[PDB]
Amino acid sequence: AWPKVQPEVNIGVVGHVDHGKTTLVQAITGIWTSKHSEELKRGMTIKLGYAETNIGVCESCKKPEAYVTEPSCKSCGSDDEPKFLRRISFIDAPGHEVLMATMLSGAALMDGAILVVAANEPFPQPQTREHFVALGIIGVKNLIIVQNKVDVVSKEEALSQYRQIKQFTKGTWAENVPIIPVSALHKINIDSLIEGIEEYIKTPYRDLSQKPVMLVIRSFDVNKPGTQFNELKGGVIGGSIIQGLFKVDQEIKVLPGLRVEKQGKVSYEPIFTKISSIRFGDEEFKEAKPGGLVAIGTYLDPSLTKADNLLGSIITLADAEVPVLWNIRIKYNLLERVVGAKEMLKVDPIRAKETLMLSVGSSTTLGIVTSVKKDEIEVELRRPVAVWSNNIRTVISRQIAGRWRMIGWGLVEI
Ligand SMILES: Nc1nc2c(ncn2[C@@H]2O[C@H](COP(=O)(O)OP(=O)(O)NP(=O)(O)O)[C@@H](O)[C@H]2O)c(=O)[nH]1
Ligand SMILES: Nc1nc2c(ncn2[C@@H]2O[C@H](COP(=O)(O)OP(=O)(O)O)[C@@H](O)[C@H]2O)c(=O)[nH]1
């Protein structure tokens, strides 16, 4: 049989609202991310859609038809069980997509991505352009561009758009990003895309020795009304593990931790607890490595997690040595101009004393610029951030319009 393992890679599906995301993830996993089917034990997030599936391959059959997401090769001859390759995950935003602190969270999480393009829409729609830059900012490594709705246009028209795309990434990092044409609605050429993600979005190297770090993006009080006091469960923490691994029964801590305001002065003292359980989807595990969205059971007073109280925090082992700074130094790189409302907009260089919004992992706090230089700036922060590794990508954003907007990215230096 195939093994009941956990996902080992996260793929985010980004698509201009109405190009195919929700349906495309379904054509692959067989699940509908956005609005869906179970909560009694089905993995949930702050708001974003999420789905997982196994990936296999039939040894006898030819490709791409040989890739399967289920343990069967009948579809092409064999009564033989196909070869398992890996279990994967998909994340996307329900009938929408950026939401501004969401696209920033899903960044330290995404291992690769998929840009959905409607084949019956002139390329590139505005929202696609910004998705495109957002991905560059985010540092999206492995990318695949999917030409959706290809079944509603002619081969020639599809080809026409194909070129437009190829000659839009003609001079960017996307230079070679593959373009795969499909129909998520009617499921057409879906097998090629699965080949395409097996080739272009490979599972990243995993140094299992690195110190464990998980980004918290969800947390709650699982207890239902009526629960008896001696029978209630500890708080629960949903997040994605970035590096290392966590095991049930390990002592851990939450950073920055608990916000305490003694003497009218704010300050955060880390929150300690132990892992009571690890769950991926609806199945329990012993350990939790990077890949997929994991649910961690603790021994925390439900008041602590209740209603995503711990969102933006990170979990590490109790003795892990992780700074928690209220002032950080960032080696940055801005954008020349941002996708403005009308047509464009030019970004002003970082001016001192102006308030910005940085993203660190699943964190997003506002800070005041205290220092500003060619390649570096320093900022005071409203709330502190845990810095588990040296250079951790950060996303600088400015309330350009009336709405915050990415204006560059940088590395947190310590
Ligand atoms: N690791 C782990 N995860 C669990 C356990 N029990 C439940 N979960 C997680 O809890 C999730 C569902 O949470 P949910 O019941 O919707 O929280 P809630 O009851 O809406 N919080 P509230 O009652 O304040 O509205 C599932 O996706 C599942 O993974 C457990 O014992 N261990
Ligand atoms: N013809 C065609 N229609 C599609 C395809 N994928 C999705 N659709 C249509 O678009 C709708 C879903 O749009 P949706 O995926 O929710 O937009 P999103 O939430 O931004 O991803 C469905 O009602 C489908 O009828 C496709 O591959 N081909």
Q: What is the CATH number of the domain that holds 254?
A: 2.40.30.10
> Quick one: 89 and 234 in the same domain?
no
> Quick one: 11 and 155 in the same domain?
yes
Q: Is 103 left (phi over 0), alpha (psi -120 to 50) or beta?
A: alpha
> Quick one: 8 and 48 in the same domain?
yes
Domain count, the chain: 3
> Quick one: 94 and 160 in the same domain?
yes
> Quick one: 270 and 145 in the same domain?
no
Residues that constitute the known binding site = 18-23, 43, 45, 58, 61, 73, 76, 148-151, 183-185
Whether ligand 1 lies within 6 angstroms of the CB of 248 is answered as: no
> Quick one: 114 and 249 in the same domain?
no
Task: Report d(CA 41, CA 239) in Å as an integer.
Answer: 16
> Quick one: 167 and 298 in the same domain?
no
Name the residue among 212, 216, 222, 215 with its Cα closest to residue 310: 216
Whether ligand 2 lies within 6 angstroms of the CB of 26 is answered as: no
Resolution at which this structure was determined, Å: 2.7
Cα-to-centroid distance, 178 and ligand 2 (Å): 21
- Taking the CA of residue 24 as reference, the ligand 2 atom at the shortest distance is 6
Among 23, 125, 151, residue to substitute to test ligand 2 (most atoms within 8 Å of Cβ): 23
Phi/psi of residue 198, nearest 5 degrees: -75, -25
Among 39, 42, 47, 236, residue to substitute to test ligand 1 (most atoms within 8 Å of Cβ): 236
Cα-to-centroid distance, 118 and ligand 2 (Å): 9
Other beta carbons within 10 angstroms of residue 156's beta carbon come to: 7
Name the residue among 152, 119, 149, 154 with its Cα closest to residue 27: 149
DSSP state of 173: G
Q: How was this structure determined?
A: X-ray
CA angle 212/298/214 to nearest 5° reads 25
Torsion (CA) 389, 51, 141, 179 in degrees, nearest 10: 180
Cα-to-centroid distance, 238 and ligand 1 (Å): 9
3-state class percentages of the chain: helix first, strand second, coil last, to nearest 5: 15, 40, 45
Domain closes at, from 267, 295, 321: 321
Q: Is 101 left (phi over 0), alpha (psi -120 to 50) or beta?
A: alpha
The answer to whether 247 and 297 have CB atoms below 8 angstroms apart is: no
Beta bridge partners of 368: 355, 380
> Quick one: 100 and 169 in the same domain?
yes
> Quick one: 56 and 108 in the same domain?
yes
CA contacts within 13 A on the Cβ side of 80: 13
> Quick one: 92 and 225 in the same domain?
no
Token pair recorded at residue 279 = 């769950």
Whether ligand 1 lies within 6 angstroms of the CB of 277 is answered as: yes
Cα-to-centroid distance, 279 and ligand 2 (Å): 31
List b or e across 237-254, with b for residues whose CB sees 16 or more CB atoms inside 10 angstroms. bbbbbbbbbbebeeebbb
The answer to whether 247 and 294 have CB atoms below 8 angstroms apart is: no
> Quick one: 79 and 138 in the same domain?
yes
Residue located nearest, by CA, to atom 19 of ligand 2? 95
Q: What is the CATH number of the domain that holds 99?
A: 3.40.50.300
Cα-to-centroid distance, 183 and ligand 2 (Å): 9
Q: Which amino acid is at 82?
A: P
Task: Report d(CA 101, CA 45) in Å as an integer.
Answer: 13
